[PDB]
From a paper:
RIG-I is an essential innate immune receptor for detecting and responding to infection by RNA viruses. RIG-I displays exquisite sensitivity in recognizing minute quantities of viral RNA in the cytoplasm and then forming a tight RNA:protein complex that releases specialized signaling domains (CARDs, or Caspase Recruitment Domains), which engage in a cascade of downstream interactions leading to induction of interferons and a rapid antiviral immune response. As observed in previous crystallographic studies, all complexes visualized by cryo-EM reveal a familiar ring-like structure in which the domains of RIG-I are wrapped around dsRNA and the blunt duplex terminus is capped by stacking and hydrogen-bonding networks with the protein. RIG-I selectively differentiates viral RNAs from host RNAs by adopting two different conformations, each of which is specific for a different type of RNA (host or viral).
Given that SLR30 duplexes contain a substantial “runway” for the movement of RIG-I away from the blunt duplex terminus, we wondered whether RIG-I might have a greater propensity to migrate into the center of the duplex when it starts out in the HF conformation, complexed with “host-like” RNA duplexes, such as those that terminate in a 5’-OH rather than a 5’-triphosphate. To address this question, we created a new RNA called OHSLR30, which contains a “host-like” terminus adjacent to a long duplex, and we solved a series of structures with RIG-I in the absence and presence of ATP. However, when purified OHSLR30:RIG-I complexes are incubated with ATP and Mg2+ before cryo-grid preparation, we observe two populations of molecules: A minority population (24%) that remains bound at the duplex terminus, while a majority population (76%) moves to the center of the duplex, supporting the notion that the HF conformer is a dynamically active state that readily binds ATP and assists in proof-reading. Consistent with this, the end-bound HF species contains clear density for ADP within the active-site. At the same time, with Heltnt engaged in the CTD or along the dsRNA backbone, the Hel2 domain remains well-folded in these complexes, enabling them to engage with ATP and stimulating active RNA dissociation or translocation away from the high-affinity terminus. Rapid off-rate from these host sites is further enhanced by active cycles of ATP binding and hydrolysis that further accelerate RNA dissociation and, in some cases, cause RIG-I to move away from the terminus to even lower affinity sites on the duplex interior.
Author numbering: 241 to 922
The structure:
RNA sequence: GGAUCGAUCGAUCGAUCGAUCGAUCC
């Protein structure tokens, strides 16, 4: 590849010894700019010394891509390129990998962990430091942790040969800025976070960049919601019936939350039902036998209410048949699991109106107008250009399958081939798609491939390799200015559209203010690129000193841990699970329970996605061992040579033995008890 | 099992927490 003029212009300030925050839209070719910077940096050293340039890549796909690119480009002059990730540093010494190599493409988390425990005492071992998607420097990003270590070494007084920051990004972003002054302040703060005084943008060779980074045009498609909703009536009646049934066992159900006006099929109702569910978990009775039944019935009632609300939310954006299939799948999973009297009554009450629900869903006179407008614009764009590819975005993982089923089950648009792509999802749930599946989906999506449209989540916003599309569609998709720019930089074809379909003026207003914030960011960058380097260095030094003082001031010491024995009970059945005395912490993050009395309290099931994070190994998954509970208590791992269950506090109620009060914790950091470290003995 | 980011919503007094969803990493 020949270095273009604007690429050399962007790489010119970096080949001088000063840190740079070079930014360019998607498709400019910043990887080649970083390659040129790396090539120029590794030759400025005379005979006797060499460089240790490092390259940070957050995501594993882009990490492997950059590693392969650097290998194909640099294994010809005599440089040793390597790469560390989660499946590489299981037992290999990272220090020997860094010392015996010149170019490293490790992930920021591995570097953070090494700097933390025992490896790489200082960042002076490297000479160059490139950050892929450097805009991710934020409150607590690993990039920001590495930069915090860098700044603590710099402003500590004992600084040595510090490396050079060549962090590359596509959109600097403004954050929560409202005017140009706040945008400039945020840009200066981000510049001081990376310890750089130069922002390299394309100014002279702007005509060459526009010949390959052609930006699309945006079209707002605000439509009207459905007026005749016969599906919401039956689901609302079922929700009212379930709420009235739940009010029988809990008279003060309306006082458990401070939400006054709740509406079915919204997010406020979801918050209300979650608050109610959390309030009935700490419900205590001096019987230890009636409290469990009431708590279980309330848990089931709130779960059914949450499922009804989710079905209404799905039907608001998709067809009535999709929410009905979701409800049928939920009730079939309920039937396959434990079947008590409450669940039997709920299932029979649902089946009482399931026939009317099916009759309403089969009626084609109440089709979602949003889907009608989507079909219209899709068929229009595919009649104008048959060789078009769509990257239609959807904010919900449960809605991409609905959109795929709607596209497949529609005779009006048969030229489409769904190529849906969601992502890895939860690491302890059987949801999402794996990395090989994602690679196969992305490889089969080309101009001549077997997929001309993919319904993707926010996974296609950050660094990823997708074909050049021209039919970007945002179906109720809204974010920030950074995500807006990332989405717009996806349709960089020769003439593209960025349609935004929604049924709410709030999304249109948010897109307008995002465009305004992008203009503000551009103006702030243009203003900042005219200041002197000395005053900018002084300003970023002052900002770094202030941030370091703030970070060193908020060093909250560990409070006095409650050295009192308390019991952890199941969150669904309120059954005695274990005690806080037999709780051991492996590596200050994972909490296990030892003892033969606890092994008979849970049951093991095969894990869907086994993997090793640091030194464990997911062998199974633990659930409650009651009559019919099936409550997720944690997971089963193998630390060194023995199988141990590690649990999470987000599924256990903490009851004090002496006082008797119950409290709920979401993370183990909020649980301040006498945590004993794990001993390989016993 | 843990950590982090983004979006939306709720409580309290522009700020602090809480909830939902998506994504990333170990
Ligand atoms: N000088 C060049 N000549 C030919 N192709 C190039 C050149 N520079 C970049 N490209 C192509 O453009 C694509 C841009 O990818 P990359 O460099 O990662 O930037 P981005 O992250 O914006 O996509 C690369 O896949 C590369 O093949
Ligand atoms: Mg890049
Ligand atoms: Zn239980």
């Amino acid at each position: 590849f020949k270095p273009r003029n604007y690429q050399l212009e962007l790489a010119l300030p970096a080949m001088k010894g000063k840190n740079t925050i070079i930014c360019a839209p998607t498709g400019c070719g910043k990887t080649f700019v970083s390659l040129l910077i790396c090539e120029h940096h590794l030759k400025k050293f005379p005979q006797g010394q060499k460089g240790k340039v490092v390259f940070f890549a957050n995501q594993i796909p882009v990490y492997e891509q950059q590693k392969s690119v650097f290998s194909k480009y640099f294994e010809r002059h005599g440089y040793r390129v390597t790469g560390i990730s989660g499946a590489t540093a299981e037992n290999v010494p990272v220090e020997q990998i860094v010392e015996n190599n010149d170019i490293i493409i490790l992930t920021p988390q591995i570097l953070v962990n090494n700097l933390k425990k025992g490896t790489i005492p200082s960042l002076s071992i490297f000479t160059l430091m490139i950050f892929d998607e450097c805009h991710n420097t934020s409150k607590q990003h690993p990039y920001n942790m590495i930069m915090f270590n860098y700044l603590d070494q710099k402003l500590g007084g004992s600084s040595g040969p510090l490396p050079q920051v060549i962090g590359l990004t596509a959109s600097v972003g403004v954050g929560d800025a409202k005017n140009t002054d706040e945008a400039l302040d945020y840009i200066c703060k981000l510049c001081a976070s990376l310890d750089a005084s130069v922002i390299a943008t394309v100014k002279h060779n702007l005509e060459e960049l526009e010949q390959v980074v052609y930006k699309p045009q945006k079209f707002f498609r605000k439509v009207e919601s459905r007026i005749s909703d016969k599906f919401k009536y039956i689901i609302a009646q079922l929700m009212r019936d379930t709420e009235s049934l739940a009010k029988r066992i809990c008279k003060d159900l309306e006082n458990l939350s401070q939400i006054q006006n709740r509406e079915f099929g919204t997010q406020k109702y979801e918050q209300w039902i979650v608050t109610v569910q959390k309030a009935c978990m700490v419900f205590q009775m001096p019987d230890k036998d009636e409290e469990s039944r009431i708590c279980k019935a309330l848990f089931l009632y709130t779960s059914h209410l949450r499922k009804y609300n989710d079905a209404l939310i799905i039907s608001e954006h998709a067809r009535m048949k999709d929410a009905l299939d979701y409800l049928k799948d939920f009730f079939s999973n309920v039937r396959a699991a434990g079947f008590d009297e409450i669940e039997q009554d709920l299932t029979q009450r649902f089946e009482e109106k399931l026939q009317e629900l099916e009759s309403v869903s089969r009626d084609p006179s109440n089709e979602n107008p949003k889907l009608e407008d989507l079909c219209f614009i899709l068929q229009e764009e595919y009649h104008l250009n048959p060789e078009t590819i769509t990257i239609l975005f959807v904010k919900t993982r449960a809605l991409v399958d609905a959109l795929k089923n709607w596209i497949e089950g529609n005779p009006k648009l048969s030229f489409l081939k769904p190529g849906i792509l969601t992502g890895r999802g939860k690491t302890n749930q059987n949801t999402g798609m794996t990395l090989p599946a994602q690679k196969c989906i992305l490889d089969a999506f080309k101009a001549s491939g077997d997929h001309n449209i993919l319904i993707a989540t926010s996974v296609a916003d950050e660094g990823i390799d997708i074909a050049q599309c021209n039919l970007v569609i945002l179906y109720e998709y809204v974010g920030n200015v950074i995500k807006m720019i990332q989405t717009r930089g996806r349709g960089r074809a020769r003439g593209s559209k960025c349609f935004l379909l929604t049924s709410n003026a709030g999304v249109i207003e948010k897109e307008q203010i995002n465009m305004y914030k992008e203009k503000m960011m551009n103006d702030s960058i243009l203003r900042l690129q005219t200041w002197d380097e000395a005053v900018f260095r002084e300003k970023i030094l002052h900002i770094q000193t202030h941030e370091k003082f703030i970070r060193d001031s908020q060093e909250k010491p560990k409070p006095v841990p409650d050295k009192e024995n308390k019991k952890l009970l199941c969150r669904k059945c309120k059954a005695l699970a274990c005690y806080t005395a037999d709780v051991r912490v492996i590596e200050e993050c994972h909490y296990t329970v030892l003892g033969d009395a606890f092994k008979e309290c849970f049951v093991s099931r095969p894990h869907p996605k086994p993997k090793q994070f640091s030194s464990f190994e997911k062998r199974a998954k633990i659930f409650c061992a009651r009559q019919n509970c099936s409550h997720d208590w944690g997971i089963h791992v193998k630390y060194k040579t023995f199988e141990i269950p590690v649990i999470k506090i987000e599924s256990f109620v903490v009851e004090d033995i002496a006082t008797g009060v119950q409290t709920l914790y979401s993370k183990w950091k909020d649980f301040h008890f006498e945590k004993i470290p794990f001993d390989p003995a016993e």
